[PDB]
Amino acid sequence: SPRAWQRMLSGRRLDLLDPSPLDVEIADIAHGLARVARWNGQTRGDHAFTVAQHCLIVETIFCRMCPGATPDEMQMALLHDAPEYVIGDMISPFKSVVGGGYKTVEKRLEAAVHLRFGLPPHASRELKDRIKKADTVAAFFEATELAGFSTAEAQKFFGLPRGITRDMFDIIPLPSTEAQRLFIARFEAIETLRVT
Amino acid sequence: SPRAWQRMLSGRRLDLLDPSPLDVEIADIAHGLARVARWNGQTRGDHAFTVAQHCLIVETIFCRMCPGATPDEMQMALLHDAPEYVIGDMISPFKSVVGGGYKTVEKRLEAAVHLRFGLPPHASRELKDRIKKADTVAAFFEATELAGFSTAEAQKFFGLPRGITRDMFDIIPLPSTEAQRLFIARFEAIETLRVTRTGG
């Protein structure tokens, strides 16, 4: 039989094509994101550079680029790649190749994750733009520091960062256990700011 | 500008949509496969369960299921998931959602990898079937031991293995550096067998 859901280590499961927010838990997300690699694993270092670590850098960069950000926006930045815990990581060039299809699932997973945590199902276009810019800045530094791209390649593909420098975050690839711990800790810190 | 290639740590690059066999090198494959996770990282263990480790289990299971396998066939088993070093890992359920363009890329990458190593560009229909059966048995064991699936779930999705047992291979997730070392070692061992079988 074709598989319709992803079982989680915690016992929960999420329907792949019509995910329910009520099946989403941050422990499940953090576990997976701390083991899923960016850049197809083509990165310098004994440990893969994980999606969880990418999320941490993105949220950090987002806050530096957007000093007026609200806690809800910070959480949307941290959780932007959360759907990868069920759909996996695919490099951007293939996102333009996949069917519609895959993109529909990705959008549904975003809504499920957001709704779970009392966030708008989708970021506004303006907020999406801010988070995407932070993502692309992170990509520039990962591409050059970790994934073997020249500065010329990274500038072409990602653009030259505007006012963000590599000393504003930590890019050395973390082991899964540490990435997981740090991801949950930041999520919990932002949750605390949100009620406030 | 959109990106048309993947640069490797070794300096070479592979074109994503029209890969050349001559840009493929096993060191690049091993490095990446030893860091790409299966099961979307939803696995028990301090370390991700990597595609490289999956390949090693598949090739071992394949040999056990197919005692008459030739060295070329062993190598095609080990390398079946090699394209993931450029296309990444996607769970099987999303293959019916992803579209024909993706499948075409996969197949072109299989050819590039195979041609690099002097193998048929694609496995015969019959070899493909044998490798797939081995892959599915590996999936059964990974699903139950690592990825949180019950025996009933794994039986439903992958079938109950027949004559393959968990003691035949190593399922606990290995760190990237060790999965990489073991993957290269097995690739090289099979390469030696290929030279033996082909003769002068």
Spell out which residues of chain A touch residue B46, defining contact as CB-CB under 8 Å: 175-177
CA distance A93 to chain B (A): 6
Q: With CB atoms and an 8 Å threshold, state whether A102 touches B98.
A: yes
Token pair, residue A74, equals 């910070």
C-beta atoms surrounding A176 within 10 Å = 27
What lies within 8 Å, CB to CB, of A186 at 6+ separation is A56, A59, A78
Longest Cα–Cα distance of chain A, Å, equals: 52
Spell out which residues of chain B touch residue A148, defining contact as CB-CB under 8 Å: 7-11
- Experimental technique: X-ray
The answer to whether B46 touches A80, Cβ cutoff 8 Å, is no
The answer to whether A137 touches A60, Cβ cutoff 8 Å, is no
CB contacts < 8 A (A, B): 173
What is chain A's percent helix, strand, coil content, to nearest 5?
55, 5, 40
Q: What residues pair up with B23 in beta bridges, in sequence order?
A: none
Q: With CB atoms and an 8 Å threshold, state whether B40 touches A85.
A: yes
For residue A115, the domain's CATH number is 1.10.3210.10
**Count of domains observed in chain B:** 1
Phi then psi dihedrals of residue B15, to 5 deg: -70, 130
The DSSP code for A37 is B
CA distance B73 to chain A (A): 26
Distance CA A12, CA A1 (A): 20
Spell out which residues of chain B touch residue A16, defining contact as CB-CB under 8 Å: 93-94
Token pair, residue A47, equals 């440990």
The answer to whether A29 touches A117, Cβ cutoff 8 Å, is no
Distance CA B53, CA A53 (A): 23
Distance CA B166, CA B182 (A): 18
What lies within 8 Å, CB to CB, of A173 at 6+ separation is A43, A44, A45, A46, A47, A48, A49, A50, A53, A146
* Distance of alpha carbon A151 from the chain centroid: 23
Spell out which residues of chain A touch residue B97, defining contact as CB-CB under 8 Å: 17, 99, 101-102, 105
Q: What residues pair up with A15 in beta bridges, in sequence order?
A: A5
Q: How far is CA B37 from CA A49, A58, B179, in A?
A: 11, 21, 12
CA distance B196 to chain A (A): 33
CA distance A137 to chain B (A): 15
Nearest to B7 among A6, A98, A148 (CB): A148
C-beta atoms surrounding A62 within 10 Å = 25
Spell out which residues of chain A touch residue B2, defining contact as CB-CB under 8 Å: 92-93, 96, 157
From the number of C-beta atoms within 10 Å of its C-beta (0-12, 13-18, 19+), residue B21 rates as: middle
Q: Where are the alpha helices (DSSP H) in B66-99?
A: 71-78, 84-87
Nearest 10 degrees: Cα torsion B108, A156, A33, B31: 50
Spell out which residues of chain A touch residue B28, defining contact as CB-CB under 8 Å: 42
Nearest to A2 among B40, B43, B93 (CB): B93
Q: With CB atoms and an 8 Å threshold, state whether A41 touches B85.
A: yes
Radius of gyration of chain B (CA): 16
Longest Cα–Cα distance of chain B, Å, equals: 52
Nearest to B37 among A35, A90, A148 (CB): A35
Q: What kind and span of H or E run contains A6?
A: strand A5-7
Q: With CB atoms and an 8 Å threshold, state whether A98 touches B98.
A: yes
Give the residue numbers spanning the domain of A155. Answer: 1-196
From the number of C-beta atoms within 10 Å of its C-beta (0-12, 13-18, 19+), residue B68 rates as: exposed
Distance CA A53, CA A49 (A): 7
Q: With CB atoms and an 8 Å threshold, state whether B3 touches A92.
A: yes
Distance CA B79, CA B24 (A): 12
C-beta atoms surrounding A107 within 10 Å = 13
CA distance A61 to chain B (A): 22
Q: With CB atoms and an 8 Å threshold, state whether A9 touches B36.
A: no
Q: With CB atoms and an 8 Å threshold, state whether B148 touches A11.
A: yes
CA distance A118 to chain B (A): 24
